[PDB]
Amino acid sequence: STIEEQAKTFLDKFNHEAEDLFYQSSLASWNYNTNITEENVQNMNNAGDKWSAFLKEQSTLAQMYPLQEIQNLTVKLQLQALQQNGSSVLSEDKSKRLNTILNTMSTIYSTGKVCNPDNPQECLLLEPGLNEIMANSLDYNERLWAWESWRSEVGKQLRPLYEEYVVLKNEMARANHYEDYGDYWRGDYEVNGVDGYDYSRGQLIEDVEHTFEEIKPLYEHLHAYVRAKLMNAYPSYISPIGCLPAHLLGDMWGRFWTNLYSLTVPFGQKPNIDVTDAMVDQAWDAQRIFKEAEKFFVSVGLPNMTQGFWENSMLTDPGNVQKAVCHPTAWDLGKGDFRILMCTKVTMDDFLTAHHEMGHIQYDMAYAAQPFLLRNGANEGFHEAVGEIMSLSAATPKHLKSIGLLSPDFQEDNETEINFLLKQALTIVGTLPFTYMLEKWRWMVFKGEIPKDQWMKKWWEMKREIVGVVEPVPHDETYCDPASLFHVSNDYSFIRYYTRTLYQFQFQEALCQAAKHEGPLHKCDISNSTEAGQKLFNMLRLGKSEPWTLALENVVGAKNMNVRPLLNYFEPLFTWLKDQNKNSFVGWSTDWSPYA
Amino acid sequence: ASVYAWNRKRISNCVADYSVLYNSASFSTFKCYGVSPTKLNDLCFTNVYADSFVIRGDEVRQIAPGQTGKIADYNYKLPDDFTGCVIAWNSNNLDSKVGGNYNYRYRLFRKSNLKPFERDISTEIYQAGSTPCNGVQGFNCYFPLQSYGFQPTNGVGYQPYRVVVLSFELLHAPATVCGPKKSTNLVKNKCVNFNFNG
Numbered sequence: 001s002t003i004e005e006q007a008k009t010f011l012d013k014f015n016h017e018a019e020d021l022f023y024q025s026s027l028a029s030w031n032y033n034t035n036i037t038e039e040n041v042q043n044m045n046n047a048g049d050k051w052s053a054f055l056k057e058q059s060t061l062a063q064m065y066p067l068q069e070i071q072n073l074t075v076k077l078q079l080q081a082l083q084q085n086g087s088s089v090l091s092e093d094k095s096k097r098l099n100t101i102l103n104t105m106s107t108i109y110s111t112g113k114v115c116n117p118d119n120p121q122e123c124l125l126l127e128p129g130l131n132e133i134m135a136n137s138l139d140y141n142e143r144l145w146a147w148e149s150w151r152s153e154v155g156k157q158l159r160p161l162y163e164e165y166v167v168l169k170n171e172m173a174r175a176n177h178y179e180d181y182g183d184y185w186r187g188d189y190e191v192n193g194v195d196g197y198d199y200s201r202g203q204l205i206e207d208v209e210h211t212f213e214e215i216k217p218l219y220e221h222l223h224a225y226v227r228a229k230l231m232n233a234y235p236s237y238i239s240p241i242g243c244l245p246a247h248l249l250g251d252m253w254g255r256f257w258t259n260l261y262s263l264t265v266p267f268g269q270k271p272n273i274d275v276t277d278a279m280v281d282q283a284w285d286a287q288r289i290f291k292e293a294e295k296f297f298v299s300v301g302l303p304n305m306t307q308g309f310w311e312n313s314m315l316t317d318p319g320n321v322q323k324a325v326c327h328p329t330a331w332d333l334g335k336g337d338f339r340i341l342m343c344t345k346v347t348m349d350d351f352l353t354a355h356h357e358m359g360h361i362q363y364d365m366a367y368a369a370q371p372f373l374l375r376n377g378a379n380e381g382f383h384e385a386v387g388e389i390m391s392l393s394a395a396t397p398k399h400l401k402s403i404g405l406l407s408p409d410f411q412e413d414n415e416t417e418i419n420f421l422l423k424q425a426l427t428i429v430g431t432l433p434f435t436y437m438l439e440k441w442r443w444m445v446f447k448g449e450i451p452k453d454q455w456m457k458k459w460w461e462m463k464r465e466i467v468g469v470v471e472p473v474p475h476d477e478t479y480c481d482p483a484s485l486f487h488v489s490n491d492y493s494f495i496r497y498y499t500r501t502l503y504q505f506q507f508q509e510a511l512c513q514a515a516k517h518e519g520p521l522h523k524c525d526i527s528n529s530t531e532a533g534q535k536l537f538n539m540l541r542l543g544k545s546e547p548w549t550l551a552l553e554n555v556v557g558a559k560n561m562n563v564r565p566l567l568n569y570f571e572p573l574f575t576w577l578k579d580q581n582k583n584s585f586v587g588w589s590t591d592w593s594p595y596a
Numbered sequence: 597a598s599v600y601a602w603n604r605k606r607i608s609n610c611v612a613d614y615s616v617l618y619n620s621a622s623f624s625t626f627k628c629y630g631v632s633p634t635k636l637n638d639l640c641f642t643n644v645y646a647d648s649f650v651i652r653g654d655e656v657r658q659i660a661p662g663q664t665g666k667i668a669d670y671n672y673k674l675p676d677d678f679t680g681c682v683i684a685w686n687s688n689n690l691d692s693k694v695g696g697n698y699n700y701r702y703r704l705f706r707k708s709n710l711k712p713f714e715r716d717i718s719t720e721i722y723q724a725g726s727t728p729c730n731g732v733q734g735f736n737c738y739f740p741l742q743s744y745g746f747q748p749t750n751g752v753g754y755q756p757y758r759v760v761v762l763s764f765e766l767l768h769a770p771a772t773v774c775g776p777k778k779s780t781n782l783v784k785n786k787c788v789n790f791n792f793n794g
């Protein structure tokens with residue numbers, strides 16, 4: 001009869017015939033990932049083609065129902081999600097050109113091998129050939145050679161491709177009623193039609209700048225301390241008044257500073273909280289790691305894992321004969337089937353990863369009651385954040401003592417907390433200026449603020465201004481330095497890490513306040529607290545049915561992303577860094593003072 | 597049978613031993629509405645209606661008086677004043693295959709809700725919009741019977757569950773489905789209380 005009833009029946013018809021097809025596609029993808037065989041690749045491709053064609057036909061049918069005559073929020077949200085054209089609005093020639101460009105960029109990035117001129121008999125790929133060199137070398141010219149050679153080859157190949165990519169994506173976005181591709185990416189956080197909880201696409205950039213202005217003093221002190229330590233490590237290259245050299249940050253692109261913990265350690269003589277030897281002595285299998293993680297989740301009040309999870313997951317490496325992707329991934333295959341694909345080793349990193357992926361599984365299980373097209377996180381940040389909070393809670397010394405992995409008489413003094421917090425800062429705080437600068441640069445490129453002939457001159461100027469990292473040698477417009485990273489080259493959003501990082505500490509403060517923890521935020525464990533689990537599960541059960549602002553109100557009591565929990569988490573470290581930086585100069589100069 | 601075309605078997609002119617069903621550990625749900633399982637083996641009824649079908653794990657809750665859902669409104673409707681027992685058990689071993697078992701269908705759309713103990717096996721195209729469907733499956737016109745997907749690796753809320761609903765009614769005709777009466781050993785030559793055939 002009415003438009004709303006027609007849409008509700010159509011959405012029921014969609015969810016019913018889309019859950020089974022998604023289950024077939026997901027199962028084929030799982031069979032490919034655990035068993036890399038050519039027939040499995042063919043089955044995955046066939047299932048993906050069927051899924052894409054079915055989604056195209058359902059979207060085409062879905063567009064015939066006008067949005068303004070539907071008053072139910074859930075029905076309107078599902079219809080809004082289905083009615084997106086994507087690349088379908090664009091012409092077939094341009095769509096095929098865009099798909100070809102994406103595939104060729106994927107092949108160039110994945111199969112890119114670069115080695116030194118005059119010795120070309122064998123070369124090293126990015127993973128793990130160049131990653132190990134960037135993370136472990138202490139030689140200035142070798143790191144400079146690797147960084148410049150990889151950016152030379154990858155950028156010179158990818159620069160015309162990126163020039164075509166920006167134009168095609170902007171054309172598709174303007175055909176889809178968006179200002180640019182940046183607006184298309186920012187539309188994920190757009191909330192419309194809810195009274196008081198509305199969020200605009202234009203507000204996201206302003207909120208990111210407002211948070212980053214408060215991020216900047218902590219980052220400046222951390223950068224000054226890292227600069228002083230790198231000056232100790234490399235005597236002449238680093239200047240007291242200038243920026244850090246780009247190739248010395250411990251990673252290929254500068255994404256994380258976690259590889260500088262050895263060089264920048266406050267107290268090297270003091271021990272770490274490594275628990276690997278304790279698990280090795282007691283013969284802890286990967287199954288025991290997942291059982292301990294399950295015990296942690298039942299401790300906080302969340303439901304335990306299904307029988308299908310234990311029966312169907314691959315938690316050990318299969319062998320030499322059977323090939324599998326080693327990356328840990330949580331799979332929500334559909335119809336209540338939740339699995340974890342991880343080649344779990346007896347390490348602390350795998351244990352924290354197991355907690356993170358089981359957090360992903362718990363998040364997936366929570367919104368199973370919701371309709372099929374709303375079975376996702378409220379935004380891209382929450383989905384990773386719920387795993388990151390488990391990673392934070394599991395890594396605490398209190399949890400390790402509780403589960404028996406650490407000695408009950410281990411002394412937790414201030415020095416271990418300072419060095420652990422500095423490592424967490426290098427991993428978490430350090431990625432924030434790089435993420436913000438990259439996303440702001442991409443938004444300005446899509447918006448047309450920066451002309452094509454001035455992309456790199458602005459970019460380094462941004463990097464000096466924001467990241468405090470200077471180029472080793474000037475680069476002209478023949479280089480394509482941003483596209484050397486995995487996310488940007490393969491058409492992925494990058495603001496998820498920034499939102500995840502802020503939401504992580506906001507959730508951590510909310511759960512710790514719920515659990516009545518009375519000390520420092522970093523010393524908080526959320527085990528044994530039913531109320532914290534209930535508060536988490538209230539947001540977890542919603543999925544994508546409700547706006548992310550309402551979900552954030554449900555957890556932390558705020559209608560917007562906040563920067564105060566992050567600063568509260570690193571406050572002891574912030575005071576320590578401020579005390580230690582009295583002799584040195586906080587802040588950097590954008591000039592070419594160290595090297596150019 | 598499928599839930600849209602649930603089989604009804606009338607059980608009459610025999611002795612119904614209900615303790616065999618109750619003491620089995622193979623049943624996940626043995627919920628009795630309007631009568632208790634302990635006194636079923638003693639009472640006598642005119643006829644027993646056994647309705648049999650297969651539904652999902654999450655849809656077992658809807659086979660009860662007063663419930664709302666796809667199965668209750670469009671597939672199998674129970675009266676509020678229902679006396680009988682709903683027995684359900686997991687059938688992942690038999691009703692699920694690796695390729696997918698699509699032999700079981702359910703009615704997804706109907707113009708009105710079903711009456712109690714009604715079977716609808718019509719295969720007419722559902723009209724969700726003002727437009728005349730005209731027999732063709734196009735826009736706003738959907739097929740009412742949708743297949744079910746059963747895989748052995750599915751979750752417990754999506755695995756197939758076989759449901760048998762026993763309906764007990766008493767009519768003016770003499771009740772012939774009686775419970776087993778039992779018997780003790782016979783003791784002679786003593787003053788005892790005898791109960792021979794009532």
Ligand SMILES: *[C@@H]1O[C@H](CO)[C@@H](O)[C@H](O)[C@H]1NC(C)=O
Binds near residue numbers: 035037322
């Ligand atoms: C992996 O694939 C091979 C080759 O098709 C097959 O023999 C083997 O049984 C498969 N193993 C698993 C665990 O699927």
Ligand SMILES: *[C@@H]1O[C@H](CO)[C@@H](O)[C@H](O)[C@H]1NC(C)=O
Binds near residue numbers: 072073075
């Ligand atoms: C919107 O539709 C859902 C069906 O998914 C229904 O449960 C809910 O009550 C509806 N909300 C309103 C306000 O009508």
Ligand SMILES: *[C@@H]1O[C@H](CO)[C@@H](O)[C@H](O)[C@H]1NC(C)=O
Binds near residue numbers: 083089
């Ligand atoms: C999708 O594209 C069709 C045809 O190009 C157009 O009529 C429709 O309005 C578009 N919908 C959206 C949401 O862009």
Ligand SMILES: *[C@@H]1O[C@H](CO)[C@@H](O)[C@H](O)[C@H]1NC(C)=O
Binds near residue numbers: 304305306
């Ligand atoms: C999960 O929890 C339920 C209820 O607490 C319990 O019956 C079940 O055995 C648990 N599952 C496992 C694998 O222990």
Ligand SMILES: *[C@@H]1O[C@H](CO)[C@@H](O)[C@H](O)[C@H]1NC(C)=O
Binds near residue numbers: 415576
């Ligand atoms: C740790 O506490 C001791 C005792 O007050 C103090 O002497 C020392 O300076 C502290 N170290 C740091 C890094 O705060």
Ligand SMILES: *[C@@H]1O[C@H](CO)[C@@H](O)[C@H](O)[C@H]1NC(C)=O
Binds near residue numbers: 299402528
């Ligand atoms: C949380 O509960 C478990 C089991 O009840 C207990 O063994 C554990 O010690 C508790 N955690 C703490 C920190 O006491």
